[PDB]
Amino acid sequence: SLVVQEQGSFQHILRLLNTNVDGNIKIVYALTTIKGVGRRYSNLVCKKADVDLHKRAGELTQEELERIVQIMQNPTHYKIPAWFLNRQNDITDGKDYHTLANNVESKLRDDLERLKKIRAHRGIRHFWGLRVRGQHTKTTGRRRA
Amino acid sequence: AVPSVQTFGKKKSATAVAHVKAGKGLIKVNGSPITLVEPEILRFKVYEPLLLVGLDKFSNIDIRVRVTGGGHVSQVYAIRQAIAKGLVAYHQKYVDEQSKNELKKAFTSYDRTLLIADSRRPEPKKFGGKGARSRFQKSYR
Amino acid sequence: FTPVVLATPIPEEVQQAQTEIKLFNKWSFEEVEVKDASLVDYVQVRQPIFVAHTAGRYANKRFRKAQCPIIERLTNSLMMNGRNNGKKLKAVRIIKHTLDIINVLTDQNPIQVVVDAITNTGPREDTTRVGGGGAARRQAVDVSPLRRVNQAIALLTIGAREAAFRNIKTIAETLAEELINAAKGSSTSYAIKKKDELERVAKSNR
Amino acid sequence: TPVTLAKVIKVLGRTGSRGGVTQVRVEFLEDTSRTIVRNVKGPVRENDILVLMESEREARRLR
Amino acid sequence: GRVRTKTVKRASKALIERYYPKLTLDFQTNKRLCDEIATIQSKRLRNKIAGYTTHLMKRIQKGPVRG
Amino acid sequence: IKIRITLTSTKVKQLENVSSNIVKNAEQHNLVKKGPVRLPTKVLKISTRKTPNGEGSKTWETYEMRIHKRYIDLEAPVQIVKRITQITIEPGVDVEVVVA
Amino acid sequence: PGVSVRDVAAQDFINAYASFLQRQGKLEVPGYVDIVKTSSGNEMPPQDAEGWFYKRAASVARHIYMRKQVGVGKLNKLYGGAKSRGVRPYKHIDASGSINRKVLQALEKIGIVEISPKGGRRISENGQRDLDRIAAQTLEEDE
Amino acid sequence: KKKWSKKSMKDRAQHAVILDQEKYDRILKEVPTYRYVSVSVLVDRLKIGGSLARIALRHLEKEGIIKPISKHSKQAIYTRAT
RNA sequence: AAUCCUGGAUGGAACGAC
RNA sequence: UAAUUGCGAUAACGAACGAGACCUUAACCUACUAAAUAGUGGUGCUAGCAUUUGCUGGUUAUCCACUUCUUAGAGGGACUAUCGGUUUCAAGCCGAUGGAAGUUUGAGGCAAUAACAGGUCUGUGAUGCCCUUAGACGUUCUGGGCCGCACGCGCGCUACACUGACGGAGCCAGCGAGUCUAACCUUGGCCGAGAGGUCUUGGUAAUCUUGUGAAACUCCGUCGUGCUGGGGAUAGAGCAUUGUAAUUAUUGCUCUUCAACGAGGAAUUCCUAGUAAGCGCAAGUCAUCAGCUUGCGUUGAUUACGUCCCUGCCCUUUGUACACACC
């Protein structure tokens, strides 16, 4: 029932983390465009940064934006329970991170490379491009590439 | 003592028992009035006997229903059938027969199931198929 | 009229819809005289109902469904295409919203409107195969009133459904504008278009 | 674009290779005493009413 | 269909040809004397026999019947 | 004394004959009781493929076992209780008496 | 005439009651609120998220007033629901139990609820009168 | 991979999610004379988004320009007050 | 007391035996 | 006629099997028998509000009374009853009335003669023959494999979205299973986000799990036609459980990854009433694992009530160079 008319300070698509984020859609499902970011993490961080989730992304302040960025790239300092993380007890240092736009794929490649140079079964499977989770390969994944 | 009866309406598996007696016109359903059923339209469906016969006949009498079994819709249908049956039995026993029979006539004239239960029962499930009549599928080649 | 009191409270409008008259959900059933004959004795009006939900069994015998209220037939047809099978309650809600809309627009009885639409969109002729074997053709023939009715209803429902598919306009308002275009005769209605198609083909294959 | 109403008086039988069709003899309401034979598509009974888009025709009776 | 078997019809014929000065055209009493006068293992069968006997008596009341 | 007697058998007419002779014995001895409470009989289903091998039409077969359970509450002296434990014994019928 | 919770609609009653408790602002909040889904069978947390603990407490309180005794098992059985296991068919799943457990603990804290014999929890008389008054106000709002 | 169909594209409308003073007063002047009003009305007319239409219906109903007749969620229905 | 009446059918293509 | 089911006709008469009959199950019984391992009402005690009577509840040793609902057991009840038509006017058939039920009431079980060179020696301590019979094809232990994938077929599960998804509240079934020398179904209490863990409890069971408060469903809100908050495969990482052992992930949970898919071509399957279809639940196998089956129930349609055109089936007549029989 409330209707603020508008101001021209609105912006369409913006940029952060080297990602062309689309405005004019609600902030949570907007942020989930980022690689390494899902609905849970996004809703949570937008809650922790003290944001109105009814708002649209393209109508915001750079301060809110950068605070959200900081919370995203440094979660634990803002009281996150450490099991939301996509990469915890990582593989080498045992510290718990949350990999993002390019780091997600880079780390995935690093893991596959590790296993391949290890000559592990999973690594060989990935190297051949087959299925790895123990699925069957008789009738499925035919036109896989 | 009180002039009082107890009847029941039925459905697939939903049963609506209803005690009835002389009272002041309170009409309850397991804890609560008729107006709080919340299909919100089957509400009108269960009003129907009252809407047919007028509410004046309900002033001197109270009803209390306990319902179980089946889904919400079946519960509603059992409810209204039990209601009509209790009203009819009351008008039979304590009131004369003319009121009872014209009441029954009006009910059956609007709808038959308000008094009698529909004998449609679930048919069982046979092998070779998920349901009763349906089979799975035929494969030739 | 008199507003009576009970131990439990009853609203006055429901008291009125109880004793003063038997409505629809909230509409009249009278002054809805069908216009075209030969659909009479096959649409069930003058036997009012407060809701189109009824555990009626017209599927035991042949011509029983004529005594089923047309609105129950509408609700019945609305629940199809898989996921909507059953869920008659939703169909009824949709009917109710639709009638509200058809009472705000074209403020006549929406019941009168839909029955006039039915009478309008009744395919009077239809083609069919007849032959001495390999020598067979699409002979055109006359349609029963019952079949006119069923075909009309199916056409209306399908037009509304295919209109509301994959787009924002609700099933209800689609149905509403379809019924309106059909009641008037517009050639924009899916139903009217199919009807003119069929009758033209019948004319051609005489 | 006129029509002609007719009342059913006598059903004859089913027809068509697939039997989804019915023969009937009707009686015109206006200009009564006129009885024509026709084919029909769907379910039908006596005393029903039909709408000949053309009244001047009739199918090959099978009898 | 609702057709009756030769067992039914034979038994009904026997009962009619040797208990005519007896049972009338009421299904209920004809049943209640059939189960008394003869041995039947099923209520269903007894009812069928009673009904057919009653129909044959209906026939008899207007002229005879062959057999 | 407050005994329960329980009959957990299959052959319903045997169970009924046992219950009947027992209750006439109890009432001619003039003993208070509850009538024979017939618990709702229970069915044991077993659905199996008729065929031993795997081929043939996909047929199934449900073998049933009906079980009828009755029980009675008595207040009765020890001597009548003992002789009753002795008597009214039918084959194919499982019976059990308990006190308190 | 006297009234009960059984004499008022559930949705509006619960709305009024959770509003009353959020206005009262004393009951409890665990701290890990607005972080969970209430159910492994859910996929997103609640949409409001500035509350809803009051709402769940209201629902369970009404439930207890309707019933005699309840348990975390019953509440999980109830508030749980259809899980979407991707491709495999939907299935019933019990809701989160710790949430309802903390709800009941906070309710015993505020004194609306007590522990029952025969296990489980039970309505209090204080809670009885309080809910009666709230329902009175509820069907008073329409005057 | 043969598809066995045609699968043409669409026009891809670009409805608005926010408004402006021009859109707002255009709404305020044009919502009357709409004998029937709802979300699909306010989107096949004015190219606002669905959430905008919801909020705007609520707004107009608040002050009273549109008359509500039924407020079922998933189907809100109003007319013009005259 | 009026009173005129009837019997009737077309039809495409469809190889072979391991 | 559903039917060699009957009326009848009659070089045939009387019989038999099958069908039917029968049995089970589901519906009716305020008529019998009863029942704290099922309910109901009342009386006691007790909570709240109204208070002015009341309403809503709770209350095992408060008892009292009853059995409508629930269970059963014994019986009854429909036989097409009555009426009107139509039929050589018989079998019967159609409509209507009544009736709980009027398509052999509904669905099932049983289900003939004769045969298939159907399938099964991997169920059989059923089995003849042949092979083998101590570096055995016996037996048993380790580890693999039965899942291996460039591809083609069939049973299905998911969806391709607003008749919607998501979040809240709302909130209703029935079928049945369950610990003994075992360790099963688990209530309740605590912890944990969650899975789950843990301390306890009842139960050999109409009693306890369990009202199995299931899901779909409804009311509110967000979303907004954008391969989109649809869809959620493929992957990564981590936390849990079962099991000696999970590594080609057993399975469960969390986060992240978010691909085809925009209603499906030739062809083709099932289906006539509580049925299709949707919606889930139980049991089976089971240490764990349902996307499968067998049963269960909840919501609940359309369209016929006809035909032999296709696919086939039964009887008769006819023709036939056919007889491992139109392949």
Curated annotation (Swiss-Prot), chain A:
Keywords recorded for this protein, A-Z: Acetylation, Cytoplasm, Isopeptide bond, Methylation, Ribonucleoprotein, Ribosomal protein, RNA-binding, rRNA-binding, Ubl conjugation
PROSITE patterns per UniProt: RIBOSOMAL_S13_1 (PS00646), RIBOSOMAL_S13_2 (PS50159)
Record PTM: N-terminally acetylated by acetyltransferase NatA.
Residue list for modification N6-methyllysine: K47
Superkingdom as given in the UniProt entry: Eukaryota
Record bears the keyword Phosphoprotein: no
Stored SUPFAM superfamilies: S13-like H2TH domain
Any GO BP: cytoplasmic translation
Cited Gene3D superfamilies: 1.10.8.50, 30s ribosomal protein s13, domain 2
Protein location: Cytoplasm
Molecular function GO terms recorded: rRNA binding; structural constituent of ribosome
A family per Pfam: Ribosomal_S13
N-acetylserine PTM positions: S1
GO CC annotation terms, alphabetical: cytoplasm; cytosol; cytosolic small ribosomal subunit; mitochondrion; small ribosomal subunit
Crosslink (Glycyl lysine isopeptide (Lys-Gly) (interchain with G-Cter in ubiquitin)) position: K35, K48, K79, K95
Family recorded in the similarity comment: Belongs to the universal ribosomal protein uS13 family.
Subunit structure: Component of the small ribosomal subunit (SSU). Mature yeast ribosomes consist of a small (40S) and a large (60S) subunit. The 40S small subunit contains 1 molecule of ribosomal RNA (18S rRNA) and 33 different proteins (encoded by 57 genes). The large 60S subunit contains 3 rRNA molecules (25S, 5.8S and 5S rRNA) and 46 different proteins (encoded by 81 genes).
Further facts: Present with 48100 molecules/cell in log phase SD medium.
HAMAP family: Ribosomal_uS13
Protein name in the entry: Small ribosomal subunit protein uS13A
Source species taxonomy: Eukaryota, Fungi, Dikarya, Ascomycota, Saccharomycotina
Swiss-Prot record, chain D:
UniProt xrefs under InterPro entries: NA-bd_OB-fold (IPR012340), Ribosomal_eS28 (IPR000289), Ribosomal_eS28_CS (IPR028626)
Record note on modification: N-terminally acetylated by acetyltransferase NatB.
GO biological process: cytoplasmic translation; maturation of SSU-rRNA; positive regulation of nuclear-transcribed mRNA catabolic process, deadenylation-dependent decay; ribosomal small subunit assembly; ribosomal subunit export from nucleus
Gene Ontology molecular-function annotations: structural constituent of ribosome
Keywords noted in UniProt: Acetylation, Cytoplasm, Ribonucleoprotein, Ribosomal protein
Principal cellular location given in the protein's record: cytoplasm
Any single Pfam family the record assigns to this protein: Ribosomal_S28e
SUPFAM superfamilies: Nucleic acid-binding proteins
CDD domains on file: S1_S28E
Compartments, record wording: Cytoplasm
GO cellular component: cytosol; cytosolic small ribosomal subunit
Any further remark recorded for this protein: Present with 8600 molecules/cell in log phase SD medium.
Family to which this protein belongs: Belongs to the eukaryotic ribosomal protein eS28 family.
Function (record text): Component of the ribosome, a large ribonucleoprotein complex responsible for the synthesis of proteins in the cell. The small ribosomal subunit (SSU) binds messenger RNAs (mRNAs) and translates the encoded message by selecting cognate aminoacyl-transfer RNA (tRNA) molecules. The large subunit (LSU) contains the ribosomal catalytic site termed the peptidyl transferase center (PTC), which catalyzes the formation of peptide bonds, thereby polymerizing the amino acids delivered by tRNAs into a polypeptide chain.
Protein name (record): Small ribosomal subunit protein eS28B
Curated annotation (Swiss-Prot), chain E:
Compartments it resides in: Cytoplasm
Top-level taxon in the UniProt lineage: Eukaryota
Assembly with partners or alone: Component of the small ribosomal subunit (SSU). Mature yeast ribosomes consist of a small (40S) and a large (60S) subunit. The 40S small subunit contains 1 molecule of ribosomal RNA (18S rRNA) and 33 different proteins (encoded by 57 genes). The large 60S subunit contains 3 rRNA molecules (25S, 5.8S and 5S rRNA) and 46 different proteins (encoded by 81 genes).
Role summary: Component of the ribosome, a large ribonucleoprotein complex responsible for the synthesis of proteins in the cell. The small ribosomal subunit (SSU) binds messenger RNAs (mRNAs) and translates the encoded message by selecting cognate aminoacyl-transfer RNA (tRNA) molecules. The large subunit (LSU) contains the ribosomal catalytic site termed the peptidyl transferase center (PTC), which catalyzes the formation of peptide bonds, thereby polymerizing the amino acids delivered by tRNAs into a polypeptide chain.
Extra information: Present with 30500 molecules/cell in log phase SD medium.
Family: Belongs to the eukaryotic ribosomal protein eS17 family.
Protein name stated in the entry: Small ribosomal subunit protein eS17B
The species this protein was found in: Saccharomyces cerevisiae (strain ATCC 204508 / S288c) (Baker's yeast)
Residues of the full protein shown: 2 to 68 of 136
Curated annotation (Swiss-Prot), chain H:
Domain of life, per lineage: Eukaryota
Keyword rRNA-binding part of the UniProt annotation: no
Chief location bin: cytoplasm
One GO cellular component term noted in the UniProt record for this chain: cytosol
Described function: Component of the ribosome, a large ribonucleoprotein complex responsible for the synthesis of proteins in the cell. The small ribosomal subunit (SSU) binds messenger RNAs (mRNAs) and translates the encoded message by selecting cognate aminoacyl-transfer RNA (tRNA) molecules. The large subunit (LSU) contains the ribosomal catalytic site termed the peptidyl transferase center (PTC), which catalyzes the formation of peptide bonds, thereby polymerizing the amino acids delivered by tRNAs into a polypeptide chain.
Quaternary organization: Component of the small ribosomal subunit (SSU). Mature yeast ribosomes consist of a small (40S) and a large (60S) subunit. The 40S small subunit contains 1 molecule of ribosomal RNA (18S rRNA) and 33 different proteins (encoded by 57 genes). The large 60S subunit contains 3 rRNA molecules (25S, 5.8S and 5S rRNA) and 46 different proteins (encoded by 81 genes).
UniProt family annotation: Belongs to the eukaryotic ribosomal protein eS25 family.
Protein name: Small ribosomal subunit protein eS25A
Lineage: Eukaryota, Fungi, Dikarya, Ascomycota, Saccharomycotina
Gene transcribed to yield this protein: RPS25A
